[PDB]
Amino acid sequence: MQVWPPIGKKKFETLSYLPPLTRDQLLKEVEYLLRKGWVPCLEFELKKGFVYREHNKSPGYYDGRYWTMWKLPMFGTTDASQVLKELDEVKKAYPRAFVRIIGFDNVRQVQCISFIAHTPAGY
Amino acid sequence: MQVWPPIGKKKFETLSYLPPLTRDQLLKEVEYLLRKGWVPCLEFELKKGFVYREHNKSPGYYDGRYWTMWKLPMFGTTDASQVLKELDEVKKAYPRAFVRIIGFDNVRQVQCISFIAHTPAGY
Amino acid sequence: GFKAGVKDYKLTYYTPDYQTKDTDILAAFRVTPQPGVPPEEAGAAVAAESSTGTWTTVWTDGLTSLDRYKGRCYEIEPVPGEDNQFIAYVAYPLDLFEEGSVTNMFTSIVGNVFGFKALRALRLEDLRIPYAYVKTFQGPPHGIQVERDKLNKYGRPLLGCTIKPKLGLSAKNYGRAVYECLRGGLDFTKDDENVNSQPFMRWRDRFLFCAEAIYKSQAETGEIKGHYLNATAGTCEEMLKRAVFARELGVPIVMHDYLTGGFTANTTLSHYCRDNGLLLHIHRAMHAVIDRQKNHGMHFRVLAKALRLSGGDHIHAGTVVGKLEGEREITLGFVDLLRDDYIKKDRSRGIYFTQDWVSLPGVIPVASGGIHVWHMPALTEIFGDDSVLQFGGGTLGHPWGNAPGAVANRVALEACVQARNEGRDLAREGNAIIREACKWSPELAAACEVWKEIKFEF
Amino acid sequence: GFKAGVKDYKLTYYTPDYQTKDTDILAAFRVTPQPGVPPEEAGAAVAAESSTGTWTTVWTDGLTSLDRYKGRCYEIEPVPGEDNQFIAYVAYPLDLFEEGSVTNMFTSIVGNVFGFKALRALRLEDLRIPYAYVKTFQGPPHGIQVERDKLNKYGRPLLGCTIKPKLGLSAKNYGRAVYECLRGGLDFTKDDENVNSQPFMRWRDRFLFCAEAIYKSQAETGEIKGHYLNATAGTCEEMLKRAVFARELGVPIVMHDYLTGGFTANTTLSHYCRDNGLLLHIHRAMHAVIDRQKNHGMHFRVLAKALRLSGGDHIHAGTVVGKLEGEREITLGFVDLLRDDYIKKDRSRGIYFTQDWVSLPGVIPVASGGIHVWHMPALTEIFGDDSVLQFGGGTLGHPWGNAPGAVANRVALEACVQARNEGRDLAREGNAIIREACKWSPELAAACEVWKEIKFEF
Amino acid sequence: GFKAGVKDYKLTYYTPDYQTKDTDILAAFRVTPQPGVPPEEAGAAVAAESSTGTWTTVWTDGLTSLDRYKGRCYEIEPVPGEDNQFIAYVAYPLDLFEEGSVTNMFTSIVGNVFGFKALRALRLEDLRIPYAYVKTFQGPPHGIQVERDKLNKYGRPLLGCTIKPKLGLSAKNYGRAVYECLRGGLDFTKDDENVNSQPFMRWRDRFLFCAEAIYKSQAETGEIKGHYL
Amino acid sequence: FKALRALRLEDLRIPYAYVKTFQGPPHGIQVERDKLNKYGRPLLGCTIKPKLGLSAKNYGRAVYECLRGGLDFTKDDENVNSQPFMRWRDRFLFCAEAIYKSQAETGEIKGHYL
Amino acid sequence: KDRSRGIYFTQDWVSLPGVIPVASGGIHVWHMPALTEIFGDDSVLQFGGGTLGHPWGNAPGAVANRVALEACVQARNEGRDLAREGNAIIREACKWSPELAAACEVWKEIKFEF
Ligand SMILES: CC1=CC(=O)CC(C)(C)[C@@]1(O)/C=C/C(C)=C\C(=O)O
Ligand SMILES: O=C(COP(=O)(O)O)[C@H](O)[C@H](O)COP(=O)(O)O
Ligand SMILES: O=C(COP(=O)(O)O)[C@H](O)[C@H](O)COP(=O)(O)O
Ligand SMILES: O=C(COP(=O)(O)O)[C@H](O)[C@H](O)COP(=O)(O)O
């Protein structure tokens, strides 16, 4: 019988309960995104990497859901390596940032995929 | 494509998106204020240089809009150098203060001009 | 000229040359007539009784226009096996129905016709809801896109858990079980359908302790959490009291049993949830009383369309693989009817009619009931990402407790998501994906050992 | 000690030595198991999933006392056929139920068990409502005695009539048909179940024209008149708007479809009617979807008991002789359950349990559906004075119009009443009584010639 | 791919092969373009600015489906004569509109397009309100049949009368003029559109005196009377 | 009027005695600048585009991005009320999140005309 | 009264608050000097397409509009004529603001003259 730690286990939604993604596993996620016809986009955050409720507490209101957009959604990108080129660029400019890769479906108008691609050392 | 930083870009209203004002550019702002027939006044703050909402959160309520008045509005002043003499005096007394120069129009009873004239090193 | 007396229903109500209008509500009834009752008469009797007709000629028919208002049996389709079974297609004019009222739609279509002495059995298989009628309903308080946007959850099915035992736990123990489940990786926990307000646990006490559990588990994990608080009650006043308190606590989701609570109360709650930003989870308690038998009742697909019109953000849609009845193809068919904007006629999936939803929000289907970790690949493959997979016994039955139970389900789900995204076949490589995940997850390995060989095949 | 894994349901949920308590809710389920499923296991699975159990062992059971809360199959009764059908008697402790909530009672008892893969079919035949649970309900807003006292009507069944065609009439034509029916001797007229508020006739227009008709016909005849105004709506807010306006008109009776509206909305209306002196007529629209088949669903006697708890002054109870299904002995059985204070167990009438109502008011049963003048003696004999006999087609289908149609029905009823009171056998001298009354009633003679030979035998 | 800058409206908004849907709101605009503005561009500018478009390319268009949401000029029908005048037929998808809101319908369709520098004049001649949109409105509180049934008036036009002078009468004189009109055979009298509540006559005073007049004239004639308040 | 070909109302002199019966603006120029703490320049705004078709989440995302770059305000298009593509309450809540995030980031008061 | 400006009557507002006028519809960075000169400080200048149409996205779009406005404000306050030195003020600002330079190249030059 093992006890699940109540500290040091902060999560980042989809794929965060699996071992950290390798560059090959990350590439495969981007390849799936593109094969599905979705538009990749990068988002980053430096100050508040987790949801909180400071400004309002009504149902469905949470602060920290919006992160900062890295440039623009990559419309027209057909190559997964171009998305990973952008990831390396954001990691270099902001080494202490939390970074997500997202994929948009314009028909249903919803993010169809989201996963953490980088985190700071300590959080 | 360049990304606008989401950190280290705190602003101070009018003129804060331009390169920092030179002593001559500052003097010219005071000269415009006086030429327009407005009353110069200096205001300073040491603890909270930005707006926040601690005491109330109803529409149009914000804390941190009022700063401390430096002496009184300079009624009768016709010389811009006298305003800059007062700026140097506040800067000397409070080196870690945020300092604004404001100009009042008594007819419309509104501040017609406001610009940051000094800030602490780190904020 | 008015002539008193009984005439055959087929004289007015059987119209085989009728061209259906895009504004008509169409019904596909599986009719089993009594011996000696011709299909044309049985079909016309169904059309007449469920619309404007009665057993004898009434003079008042002449004050109105039956041509304009009558329900019409426009087609009889003979059926394989059962004798002398047939599908009677009935068209009802838009004017017969009260706008925004599922209660009124059911009252006419399904009100009295099932009790006809002239029939042995009757099953309503499908309803074509005209898009002009769809527009009179609010539909889901939020819908799939809005719900995912509010919860900040993308790219995988959502994970839930029902607190167990169904009944008997105190409010404090309920909140303790809730916090332990949520902190382990489940997005949601939930009251059971029958947990309302009882001597063992009063609702307000449960709501407060569960809110404490939601906020503790959310702060701990960094992920948005919810616990479906049951608003189902004896009256609408109690129902709304419960939704008002959930709103005061700032919690994201509430739940309702639409069939036992009823359509009138469900539509009231759906409106309240839209006005107050609450997500609404729906339980289909009592559906199998109505939808189980092939020869009589109403297929779940009709009850599913009725819920989408009345309003709900989630609806229980079966598991296929779990402890309760549900066939694959029929399930996939009603899942499309719940989620999609346009669903083409497809008899292989039980879709008798093309259904247009004219942008009404989609409902998230919920797989719940006797499911565990080994079912994860099959569940992910059948439902895809726009679903909620719920594990009551599959979480609280884990040998190490709730948090490890929740980790096991979350790891199993994420392992299936990554595998699928990598090009693996969940339908074939299922067991292998899970066994691979067991090697690095002790929580999953412990769940796998307990539930090996647990299947539901009848 | 907690041991994870699946165990048989029969280990905790089959208790053949259990002594039922007077506080237990008892259920008589007709179970058809899948081949290879023993009755003890199928029965225990029913008891478990409708109370506290799940498919696997949960550690949380130890925080509570299952002995105190569990549902228990205490008796298995093999039934004729094969099949391998049986009656599973299940006892549920009083603590499991939310006070005054029919919704909660149904959610637990019939919520999920009907969908079990391990069963082929399941039908809930009867429920013993413990008198301690009965006391938590308001029940009928008025009941038999109060209703008679309010309307000043004694010594005969009440007479009603449904306005026809079901749909299509304007508000003014509705009020015209109402006035004509009421002025001829009917005590009541009513909106059909599906008449709510539609493009052909909006509710508020109908309510005011029907009030004009009630007051005109009452002043003309000198007898109190009513028209059941339908409050059934899409939302509770709309349902209450309707009842509020009927209250403003000072009109005596309102109507609701309890199954399509739902129990939550029904209980709110029943409470509103009690607070505002309105009589509440109940339509059982949709019941035959649930209660028709012998092997699956819920017998109407359960739905009848549920209505008396939730609240209604009248309820549709079938005709026996009319166009819709209903056997004599079973009908007499549920009519006693609706009207009486104490009903002893009686299997020849389908009463599985002795039912004590601890002074909860009785409900007036309503006979409606394909009945006419020749059915009057049989109807008076089956139901007796405490009943409402309803003639839609049998009034509006009279060759001379509504008022003569109403006279015919009133004369036929009063002829049966006088004959019975004089010592005549209604079951044997039926046709003769009606034939005799034809000599002094031209209205009755005209109805008799139109409907002679119209029967419903299948 | 997103490409910043100005493009012609006709590239996205002029669709002459578009098949209108029964759910679309259709608009018949009489367009008078400025000289040098082709009808296909003026039509497309009307469709764009009354629906989803702007003067320059926005990246946000790619987050949604313009095919699903855009207004479309699907047909140009020239007007005889030469001022460059034509009828531009525009189709707007049902999703663009707020249910039961005439305000929202007018805000989109007639909101900004009439002020276009590229046009000399613009007239909206007709609108095809789709029956799916019609169903989201209550429409008249009563309508023809109900009104006649309520007033017990059949077989002829109804007769009314507006109280004169438009303004200046006191509440008592208003009621006196009302009773005299109604008692002579008119079914209705009415306030002028101008008569609301003014220093010469406050509304509540008028309403009470007009009610006295309605009931006196109805009792006298035996016919139902009304005064539009 | 049949007796006229055309008529255009060019101006109205509203008498000051009539002006006094109206509240007029809820706040007006000075009060607005005093509430927002913005002086010495025109205010800067931006209408979210496409006019119609964006979801509530995408609306709030576009809002936050505009406000954080130096605009004082963003705004719903005149067309944007409550529609199948985006219901109002959803938009209001996501735009409030965007306002508060951008205001905290820049240190200047922000608004989004709802 | 001023017929050259279409004011047929003298209008007295007896202290009723003033309304802030909003300049909106097809404007971009090159219009900033003309807008500042016509309206002055008591105005709202709105850029829909002029922000969401920037090649680098919303935040750089907003920076471009904010820099262009503040460049006009500083220039005017320094004694420069916005009606004559307009294009020069903007070109000067492009040299230190990459966001403004990127906007200037996209809209240089888009005009609306009929
Ligand atoms: C089930 C059924 C009903 C009919 O009215 C026609 C037909 C028999 C062809 C049909 O199979 C087709 C239904 C479809 C696809 C659309 C509709 O009707 O809107
Ligand atoms: O109580 C449970 C099962 O819990 P567990 O997860 O322990 O099996 C659910 O409410 C059922 O799934 C409902 O059935 P359906 O979803 O078919 O309506
Ligand atoms: O509209 C009718 C029949 O009117 P008519 O008098 O013309 O036959 C009723 O709804 C039936 O009685 C069925 O109900 P139930 O079986 O519940 O009584
Ligand atoms: O949506 C816009 C223009 O946006 P953009 O900034 O993209 O051109 C406004 O509705 C216009 O200003 C029209 O109104 P008016 O002329 O009344 O101001």
Author numbering:
A (entry chain T), B (entry chain U): 1 to 123
C (entry chain B), D (entry chain A): 12 to 469
E (entry chain D): 12 to 240
F (entry chain C): 127 to 240
G (entry chain C): 356 to 469
What does the paper behind this entry write?
Ribulose-1,5-bisphosphate carboxylase/oxygnease, or Rubisco, catalyses the carboxylation of D-ribulose-1,5-bisphosphate (RuBP) as the first step in photosynthetic CO2 assimilation. All the plant Rubisco structures investigated to date, as well as all but one of the algal and most of the bacterial Rubiscos are hexadecameric, with 8 large (L) subunits and 8 small (S) subunits arranged in two tetramers of L-S dimers with the active site located at an L-L interface, exposed to the solvent through a channel. Rubisco is activated by the addition of CO2 (carbamylation) to an active site lysine (residue 201 in the spinach and pea enzymes) which subsequently stabilizes the binding of a Mg2+ ion. RuBP then enters the binding cavity and a conformational change involving a single loop closes the RuBP entry channel essentially trapping the substrate.
Like pea Rubisco without ABA, the electron density maps define the main chain and side chain atoms of the asymmetric unit comprised of 4 L and 4 S subunits along with 4 RuBP ligands. Because the enzyme was not activated prior to crystallization, the active site lysine is not carbamylated and Mg2+ is not present. In comparison to non-ABA containing crystals, unique density was identified in two L subunits adjacent to Tyr100 and review of the same regions in the other two L subunits confirmed smaller, but visible changes compared to the non-ABA containing maps. The binding sites are similar in each L subunit and are situated in an exterior crevice, remote from any dimer interface and more than 30 Å away from the catalytic site. Perhaps of significance, the site is close to the regulatory latch region and involves residues that immediately precede and follow the 90–97 loop region implicated in binding to Rubisco activase. (+)-ABA was ultimately best refined into this density in a conformation that is distinct from both the solution or crystal structures of ABA, as well as that observed in recent structures of ABA bound to its receptor(s). The terminal carboxylate is anchored through an ionic 3.0 Å interaction with the side chain of Arg139; the ketone forms a strong 2.7 Å H-bond with the phenolic-OH of Tyr85; and the hydroxyl group at the stereogenic center forms a 2.6 Å H-bond with the side chain of Lys356. It must be noted, however, that despite the obvious attributes of a good binding site and the clear presence of unique density in subunits A and B, the density is really only obvious in two of the four subunits, the fit of ABA to the density is not perfect and its B-factors are high compared to surrounding protein suggesting disorder in parts of the ligand. Only very subtle deviations in the main chain traces are evident suggesting that the presence of ABA does not cause a significant conformational change, at least at the lower occupancies in these crystals. Overall, the crystallographic data yields a negative result, showing that there is no high affinity-binding site for ABA on RuBP-bound Rubisco.
